[PDB]
Amino acid sequence: ISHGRVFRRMGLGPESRIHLLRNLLTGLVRHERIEAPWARVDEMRGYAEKLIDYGKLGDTNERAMRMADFWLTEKDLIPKLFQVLAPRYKDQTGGYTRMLQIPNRSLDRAKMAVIEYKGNCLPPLPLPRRDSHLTLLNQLLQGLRQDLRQSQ
């Protein structure tokens, strides 16, 4: 039984899942977009956010240096991280990524999701846009909101 377990069993072991998510990290951080199964991406999101928050400190911190050295196997995306991504999110404190489900994979009919860091360069996704304000109900909302503001 499981009550309060936040992690999920993912591969042939803890080492398996961490190496798996580490490869997903090395893949994601350079393309600043990645498709993958929904569970893997859900786990990946937190690791990515914590990693960028840990790298905000800069390159002088040997802690962050060796941590990113572990978490990234290509060894070339660490400079990219420290000198691009931290400046990109210097103003941002949360919601660094966007994650959205997409149609299932071809063969295994698996549940898939795409994740990408906010403020990327490559084209955007067709995000779910909330209903327009010009609609009937939204305009009624604006109307009685104006009425309440007039009252008070």
């Binding site: 977009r33 060894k75 691009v84 084209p123 996704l125």
Partner: protein, 108 residues
């Protein structure tokens, strides 16, 4: 273990036609406004998503043939440029990549 009497057609039929064995119709579909196709509400438009993926694929091809080999990832921001465009003062220092096509109105 082993059976003892052949399951009749009536009971087999009841079992394999009971509603939970059946598929449940899903009332969670609507038309995508701009593409004109169907989509699950919480899921993205497959057509638009494939379009975007193909575009990103050719962009990746371009940046790869620019970098000319692995371990060439820069440490700066990058920007796309389409036909009929000039680099801006904002992206002066940012890397630039060229593409041979017209700017879509849905892309900025």
């Amino acid at each position: 273990a082993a059976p003892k009497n052949r399951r009749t057609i009536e009971v087999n039929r009841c079992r394999r036609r009971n509603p939970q064995k059946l598929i449940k119709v899903k009332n969670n579909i609507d038309v995508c406004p701009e593409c004109g196709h169907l989509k699950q509400k919480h899921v993205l438009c497959a057509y638009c998503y494939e379009k975007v993926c193909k575009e990103t694929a050719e962009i990746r091809r371009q940046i790869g043939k620019q970098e000319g080999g692995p371990f060439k990832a820069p440490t700066i921001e990058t920007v796309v440029l389409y036909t009929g465009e000039t680099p801006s003062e904002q992206d002066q220092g940012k890397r630039i990549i060229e593409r041979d096509r017209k700017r879509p109105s849905w892309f900025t």
